[PDB]
Amino acid sequence: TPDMGSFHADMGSCQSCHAKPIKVTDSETHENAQCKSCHGEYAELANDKLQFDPHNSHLGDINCTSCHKGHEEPKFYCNECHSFDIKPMPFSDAKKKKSWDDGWDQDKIQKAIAAGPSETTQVLVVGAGSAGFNASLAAKKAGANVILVDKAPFSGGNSMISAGGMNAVGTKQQTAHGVEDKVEWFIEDAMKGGRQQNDIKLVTILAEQSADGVQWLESLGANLDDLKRSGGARVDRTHRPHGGKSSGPEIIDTLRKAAKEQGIDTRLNSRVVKLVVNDDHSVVGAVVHGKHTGYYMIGAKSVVLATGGYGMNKEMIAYYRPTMKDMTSSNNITATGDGVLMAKEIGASMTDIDWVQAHPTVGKDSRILISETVRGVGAVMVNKDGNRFISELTTRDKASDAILKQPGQFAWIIFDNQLYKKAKMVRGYDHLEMLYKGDTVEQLAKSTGMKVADLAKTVSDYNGYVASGKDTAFGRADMPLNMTQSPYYAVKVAPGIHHTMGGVAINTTASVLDLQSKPIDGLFAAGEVTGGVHGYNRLGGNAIADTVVFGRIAGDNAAKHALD
Amino acid sequence: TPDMGSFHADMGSCQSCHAKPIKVTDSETHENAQCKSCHGEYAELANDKLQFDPHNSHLGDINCTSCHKGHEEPKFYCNECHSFDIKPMPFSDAKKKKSWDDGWDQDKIQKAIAAGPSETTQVLVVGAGSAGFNASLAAKKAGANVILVDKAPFSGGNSMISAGGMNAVGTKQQTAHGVEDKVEWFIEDAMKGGRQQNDIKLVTILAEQSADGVQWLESLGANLDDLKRSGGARVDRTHRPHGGKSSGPEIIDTLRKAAKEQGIDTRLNSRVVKLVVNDDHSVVGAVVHGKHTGYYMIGAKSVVLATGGYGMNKEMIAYYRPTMKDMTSSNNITATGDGVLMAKEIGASMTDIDWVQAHPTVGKDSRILISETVRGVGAVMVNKDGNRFISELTTRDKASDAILKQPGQFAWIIFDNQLYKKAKMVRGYDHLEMLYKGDTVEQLAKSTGMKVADLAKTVSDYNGYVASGKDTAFGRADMPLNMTQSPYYAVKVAPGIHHTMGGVAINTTASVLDLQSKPIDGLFAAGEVTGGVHGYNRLGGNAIADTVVFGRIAGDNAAKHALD
Ligand SMILES: Cc1cc2nc3c(=O)[nH]c(=O)nc-3n(C[C@H](O)[C@H](O)[C@H](O)COP(=O)(O)OP(=O)(O)OC[C@H]3O[C@@H](n4cnc5c(N)ncnc54)[C@H](O)[C@@H]3O)c2cc1C
Ligand SMILES: Cc1cc2nc3c(=O)[nH]c(=O)nc-3n(C[C@H](O)[C@H](O)[C@H](O)COP(=O)(O)OP(=O)(O)OC[C@H]3O[C@@H](n4cnc5c(N)ncnc54)[C@H](O)[C@@H]3O)c2cc1C
Ligand code: HEM
Ligand code: HEM
Ligand code: HEM
Ligand code: HEM
Ligand code: HEM
Ligand code: HEM
Ligand code: HEM
Ligand code: HEM
């Protein structure tokens, strides 16, 4: 049966990874520290010859057992989102098991509740993305004992794969760049982008506290020195790492290290599956499904929901937004709405609950945002048989409908070498192995599985139209580059679910509200699981900002509630 | 063996009720004209020496075959809402058949769209309660041809069982009674009653056009001369018929007669099951499932949803508001959220979709509101065993939530002959056969299934609480009557779903909006189907006013868009 555990046991024992009596904690702490002990850290293992490099990624320092298993078929976690063509990992002949996280067993839940709290905290934070890390750290600082839980193999959720930094007003970076900005303009900018549906109270707090938010992250050792402009802002105010990381990885690396530094132990592989209410409507705890320990209840005086959005819950999205039910997503697979479901079930109200944001051109074969600027700098779009079907400079909204009305509900973004050399993010997508390349159009058509006739018709027309400056087919406003210079490229795209603006109802101090719109006793929330900060439309930079400002507000108010 | 049809054919022939070739229309028009020919209209069938009067009810002038059936078990339609105790109707051994309206047949819907329109109109109005009749009459006044369809046996929906009139500001009834009122007061009162969530623009139009709507109904013959104050209103603004009918029956009686005078006939037993959109995102008609004719498509330049709320759709309620899933409802059985489901399915957005208003003590058998003034004037509330479980003067949301925590999720409201003799409202319940009664407290307990010992203990404890003026079980502050004078009475109650404030998003011209919150071409809506007028809580009198004001705006913009 050969196992990775048996490969090592044969040369040693079980204790070489396990404690004496074997007892794998849910985080698999002990077993991972072992691997580090004999194989070194990631830096030790980093290659650089390797194209992708499992040991040196934007994921940061996670558990080795995220991919390598003790006793079952290995996982190459990267291809949860990427589509890296990889050869079998070591020990990939081990047995296959279904995931441990199989749903909600309601009788084992009932059992856990009736047994009573098997352990007790002050503040339990559910979810270790940026909101959950901000919440646990704010709580800690106010004196409270904290338990931080996440159901995933590592930390970071959607936060860790974010791109366009954090919005703030009234910072150092802005002064340095000359930029004038006022709190009011930040509010106005967010109220406007959200179609005026956003809770002005919440937007006011976001705007206010955002400067101090950046400074806070800075205090823990993050650089947010790149200052820039994003869609919907009248003035430069999105901060980003000076010259290293994407923001998502910078911010998550810093909060993890901070959390470790204050002795907040995250528990990984631990899914809160029920909020526990006593006979007077107070949340008094939660049931956790632990990967190894199974079902237990944690009593807590305060519970903070920090679980992220619901973009990957197919049943939620079909019920809220049936016209999006055949979209992909850009999300981490963690974003299955658990927190909205648990709050809803005990009688919380929601705000804007069905408001979902999608992106028109998400990689079909690898879930990565294909920037709209690719279309903007010349790229052509085309359906599965190689035919155009709308201006490329249409609206996000129109592009998705357009795409979802095509064969296979996908399209190809398509361009030549002039675009390739003019746009580095297209060579990014190429580095990620996302492009179909073809040295003739006809070669391109056969790789992509388009129809040569049709694709040939299109480019001739497109060149025709770029020559004339007159898109007579689909009206493309402007065409800055044509399709002639050889190597021709293709990327498979389709509209994807991106952030769910709706969620749990919250007041300004991050209590979750009940059906009378009153604070539920013991229950707090922060980040994407919450509604009302973004109205009907989140802007670039506002969601990470929300996770920091209301993350900290929720953990502080949680600890106050558990202290007195 | 027989049925009514064969009993009559034996005396006459098939043609006694049916045309020659048997071709029964959806509305059963011809057959019901024949009932009245031979048997007389309701004024002639009416008795006066008769407890209920199936032939002279607040339902007003409806088809005989609402109840009497040709070829199946008769329906005493009264008992969809009431629970009168009656001997089997004539022909009661005819064959039991399932409702004709068996859900949606996707394959037959597909066929009717593939086939294209069977008939065409300018304005299709789906739903003939107040909002759809008003939309129909305004579309006909504006000069459009109109089809009005309703899936039920008779028209009127919830609107016809409405109780507590129509809010308006600036009427001649206010000037006759010395009542000063201002549009801004109406506006603020609504905004406050909605927890400040109402679309302020819809509220302003509601306020501004409310007197004109009362006047409009009065031009058609309605009486709304009585002026009273309703909950949340700061002055008296609620208009009801002087004496005579309740406001629901008055209003729907008046709109039925005016739609028949202008030549708009309602098509009955015609359920709209899909809105048909072309390829430019335009609504162009709708598939109708007619009881006799089956599935067919009506093409139309404008379609007005006036289908009412979703309080009797159990799946929608359990999804949006699971802690309300075990409530009853006071609604007519027509209120199944169809208009919202069909709208959602083609990409309409929603407003406050999940916001559901309930009433604390709706009858569990006869689904009528037991007024809180029953408890105000003395009655006691006891669970299925016969134990009190909360003060009868708590707030409404506390009373619903404590009833839902009792065994069986219902309670009994209990009182003796002193209350009965002092409150003509409970004598009305008695005439509706809603009261259980016992010569002694033990007989009452045996009739209702309470425990004899628990009820008798409750009655001596509570009588001792009235002799000391102090209720040591529950704190009721005011105990005006004990239970010592026989007969003793009870009514069975449970909180009920009553109104769904959320629904289809709308603009000020009553276009339904898409996911960019722009008007869908061809599609309009009015009444409870729509979300936004009431924010998080409807005030008494405002929803009837909403069906008039926006029903007339929807029908006028529908017609304008069809002609043009
Ligand atoms: C590709 C991408 C790029 C983005 N870029 C930006 C950007 O540039 N700017 C911006 O402002 N926003 C952006 N966003 C949106 C923003 O990143 C997300 O809204 C935000 O980071 C989510 O923060 P969070 O803390 O609420 O949740 P998340 O980071 O999603 O994390 C929640 C965590 O809760 C855990 N959890 C969930 N359910 C349970 C349970 N039952 N028990 C225990 N733990 C649980 C999860 O496993 C996860 O780790 C982007 C989103 C994506 C997908
Ligand atoms: C008992 C009670 C008393 C009330 N009293 C008051 C009051 O006094 N004042 C007040 O302001 N509010 C009151 N309300 C609320 C107000 O009565 C209702 O919100 C308002 O009447 C709803 O009107 P409507 O025209 O939107 O819908 P409705 O009157 O419900 O009518 C909708 C019509 O659409 C038909 N329909 C539904 N689906 C379809 C389909 N697929 N195809 C064809 N037809 C379809 C239905 O069969 C129906 O007849 C009361 C509610 C209740 C239950
Ligand atoms: C979960 C914990 C661990 C994981 C995931 C892990 C991972 C691996 C993998 C993937 C291989 C084979 C790779 C290949 O095909 O070359 C391997 C081999 C090996 N492991 Fe581990 N390891 C773990 C713990 C340990 C420990 C605790 C020890 C020592 C006590 C150890 C010592 C070795 C050695 C000596 C080999 C063969 C290495 C060589 O000579 O190249 N490992 N391990
Ligand atoms: C500190 C953590 C980890 C340790 C110690 C570890 C250990 C190892 C070792 C020892 C090998 C073989 C190299 C050798 O012969 O020494 C290996 C290969 C591999 N590991 Fe890891 N692993 C870790 C984490 C991860 C993670 C987080 C991932 C994915 C996200 C991953 C994916 C892989 C893959 C795909 C291979 C085979 C790659 C190749 O072809 O070179 N491992 N690992
Ligand atoms: C005969 C020797 C061993 C025995 C009997 C053993 C037994 C176990 C048991 C009983 C569990 C947990 C089941 C649960 O909680 O659901 C486990 C998990 C685990 N063990 Fe072992 N173990 C042995 C050796 C090893 C070795 C040598 C390694 C590392 C190379 C290892 C790595 C792991 C890992 C990573 C886990 C979580 C596992 C997975 O994903 O497959 N074990 N082991
Ligand atoms: C060890 C595993 C992984 C490796 C080696 C890897 C590799 C890479 C590389 C080389 C890039 C381009 C440079 C960058 O922007 O950092 C990238 C980008 C990205 N990866 Fe990963 N990835 C891994 C796992 C994941 C996972 C698990 C997710 C999601 C949960 C993910 C989502 C993304 C996203 C969204 C981007 C940005 C695309 C863009 O904006 O251009 N990756 N990854
Ligand atoms: C032997 C004589 C008769 C025959 C063969 C006959 C046939 C039918 C048929 C074929 C339908 C259509 C059902 C559908 O769409 O599935 C129908 C409906 C109906 N018929 Fe008759 N009919 C007869 C006599 C009568 C008479 C005399 C009456 C009235 C007293 C009557 C009243 C009705 C009504 C009210 C309906 C609608 C459905 C119902 O209420 O059962 N029919 N009939
Ligand atoms: C669907 C349409 C009709 C309905 C609902 C209806 C109703 C009824 C009912 C309920 C009865 C039995 C009454 C009892 O049990 O006391 C009855 C009997 C009778 N009906 Fe109809 N009827 C309809 C159409 C007609 C028409 C068109 C005629 C004449 C052509 C007619 C003539 C009679 C007669 C003569 C009797 C026997 C009454 C007697 O001799 O005492 N009905 N009808
Ligand atoms: C104009 C319309 C209707 C006609 C012609 C009609 C006809 C009749 C007739 C002929 C009878 C037998 C006794 C009598 O002759 O009065 C009867 C009894 C009855 N009808 Fe109707 N009916 C009509 C509408 C309705 C409706 C809409 C309902 C239910 C709300 C209904 C329910 C009853 C009941 C319960 C009885 C038995 C009452 C008794 O014991 O006499 N009918 N009807
Ligand atoms: C022929 C059929 C029916 C008869 C004979 C009947 C009888 C009555 C009577 C006698 C009243 C009291 C006087 C009044 O308020 O008008 C009443 C009220 C009422 N009925 Fe009906 N009913 C019928 C059908 C229905 C239906 C089908 C519904 C629901 C869709 C309904 C719902 C109500 C409501 C909500 C009230 C007001 C109760 C109150 O506030 O006291 N009834 N009905």
Q: Where are the domains of chain A?
A: 1-99, 103-353+500-562, 359-496
Residues with Cβ < 8 Å from A80, sequence gap 6 or more? A332, A333
Q: Ligand 2 pocket, B291 CB below 6 A?
A: no
- Please indicate whether residue B11, judged by its CB atom, sits closer than 6 Å to ligand 8: yes
| Chain B residue whose CA is closest to A395 | B516
| CA–CA dist B554, B133 (Å, integer) | 11
Query: How many Å from the N-terminal Cα to the C-terminal Cα in chain A?
Result: 57
Q: Are B57 and B81 in contact (CB under 8 A)?
A: no
Ligand 5 midpoint to CA A90 (Å): 16
**Minimum distance, in Å, between the CA of residue A139 and any CA atom of chain B:** 31
CA–CA gap between residue B343 and residue B526 (Å, rounded): 13
Whether B260 is in the pocket of ligand 8, judged by its Cβ within 6 Å, is: no
State both tokens at A346.
């005990």
How many residues are present in chain A? 564
CATH class, domain A359-496, is alpha beta
Candidate from A195, A322, A350 with C-beta closest to B344: A322
Please give the structure tokens belonging to residue A504: 């749990």
Q: How far is the CA of B159 from the centre of ligand 2 (A)?
A: 4
Query: How far apart are the C-alpha atoms of B300 and B102, rounded to whole Å?
Result: 25
- Adjacent-strand bridge partners of B124: B147, B303
Closest CA to A387 of A419, A361, A412: A412
Backbone angles phi, psi at A138, to 5 degrees: -60, -40
Statement: A103-353+500-562 belongs to CATH 3.50.50.60 = yes
Q: Which CATH architecture describes the domain B100-353+500-562?
A: 3-Layer(bba) Sandwich (3.50)
CB pairs < 8 Å spanning A and B: 32
Fold of the A1-99 domain = Flavocytochrome C3; Chain A, domain 2 (1.10.1130)
- Which residue do the tokens 């670039």 mark? A540
Please report how many Cα atoms fall inside a 13 Å half-sphere around the Cα of residue A276, on the Cβ side: 23
Per the rule left: phi > 0, alpha: psi between -120 and 50, beta: everything else, A520 is: beta
Give the residue on B whose Cα is nearest the Cα of A516.
Answer: B397
Q: Which residue shows structure tokens 């699981």?
A: A529
Interface test with A, best of B354, B355, B356, B498 (most A CBs within 10 A): B354
Instruction: Spell out the residues 6+ positions from residue A483 whose beta carbon is closer than 8 angstroms to its own.
Output: A380, A414, A415, A416, A441, A459, A462, A463
- Rounded to the nearest angstrom, the distance between the alpha carbon of A25 and the centre of ligand 3 is 20
Q: Among all residues of B, which ones are annotated catalytic?
A: 396
- Does the annotation flag A408 for ligand binding? no
Buried b (16+ CB within 10 A) or exposed e, B343-364: bbebbbbbbbbbbbbbbbbbbb
**Residue in B183, B258, B181 with CA at minimum distance from that of residue B218:** B258
Q: Are the C-beta atoms of A156 and A128 separated by less than 8 Å? A: yes
Q: Are A317 and A279 in contact (CB under 8 A)?
A: no
Interhelix angle for A200-220 vs A542-562, to 10°?
90
Which positions of A are annotated as active-site residues?
A: 396
Cβ density class A339-377: b for 16+ within 10 Å, e for less? bbbbbbebbbbbbbbbbbbbbbbbbbbbbbbbbbebbeb
Q: Which two tokens stand for residue A436?
A: 């179909």
User: Which positions in chain A touch B323 (Cβ < 8 Å)?
Assistant: 345-347, 515
Q: What is the rounded CA–CA span in Å between residue A24 and residue A70?
A: 11
Report CA dihedral (A305, A310, A314, A318) to the nearest 10 degrees.
110
Asked if A515 and B397 come within 8 Å (Cβ–Cβ), the reply is: yes
In degrees to the nearest 10, what's the CA dihedral of A194, A200, A203, A207? 120
Using a CB–CB cut-off of 8 Å, the residues of A that contact B are 195, 319, 321-323, 344-347, 349-350, 353-354, 397, 401, 515-517, 536
Determine phi and psi for A124, rounding to 5 degrees: -100, 120
Alpha-carbon distance values, A61 to A174, A247, B526 (Å): 32, 16, 56
Residue A386 burial class via C-beta count within 10 angstroms: exposed 0-12, middle 13-18, buried 19 and up = buried
Q: What span, in angstroms and rounded, lies between the C-alpha atoms of B332 and B309? A: 10
**Chain B residue with Cα closest to A400:** B515
Which residues sit opposite A415 in a β-bridge?
A489
Q: Which long-range contacts (CB under 8 A, 24 or more apart) does A420-426 make?
A: A420/A487, A420/A489, A422/A377, A422/A378, A422/A481, A423/A373, A423/A374, A423/A377, A425/A371, A425/A373, A425/A374, A426/A374, A426/A379, A426/A489
Smallest CA–CA distance, residue B520 to chain A, in Å, is: 14
**Ligand that lies nearest to the alpha carbon of residue A155, given by its number in the listed order:** 1
Q: Which residues have a Cβ under 8 Å from the Cβ of A488 and sit 6 or more positions away?
A: A414, A415, A416, A437, A438, A439, A440, A441, A443, A444
What is the maximal distance between C-alpha atoms in chain B? 78
Contacts of A323 in chain B (CB under 8 A): 345-347, 515
Cβ atoms of A488 and A345 within 8 Å: the answer is no
Task: State how far residue B188 is from chain A, nearest Cα, in angstroms.
Answer: 19
The residue whose CA has the least distance to atom 1 of ligand 6 is A54
Q: Please give the C-alpha separations between residue A232 and each of A179, A187, A189, in angstroms, as whole numbers.
A: 16, 12, 7
Out of A345, A401, A517, whose CB is closest to B322?
A345
Q: How far, in Å, CA of A58 to CA of A30, rounded?
A: 24
List, as one string, the DSSP characters of B498-528. EEE--EE-B-TT-EEEBTTS-EEEEEEE-ST
Distance A153 CA to ligand 4 centre (A): 16
Residue indicated by tokens 């309660």: B129
Q: Which ligand is nearest to the CA of A64?
A: 4
Could you tell me whether strands B119-126 and B146-149 are parallel, antiparallel, or unpaired per DSSP bridges?
Answer: parallel
| 3-state SS assignment for residue A362 | strand
Residues linked to residue A178 through DSSP beta bridges, in sequence order: none
DSSP state of B166: E
> What are residue B266's DSSP bridge partners?
B148
Going A401 to A405 to A408 to A414, the CA torsion angle's sign is negative
| Domain B1-96: homologous superfamily in CATH | Flavocytochrome C3; Chain A (1.10.1130.10)
Considering only CA atoms, which of A140, A153, A354, A328 is closest in space to residue B344?
Answer: A354
- From the CA of A49, the nearest ligand is 4
For residue B427, the CA-to-ligand 8 centroid distance in Å is 35
Q: How far apart are CA A92 and CA B117, in angstroms?
A: 59
d(C-alpha B121, C-alpha B496), whole Å: 39
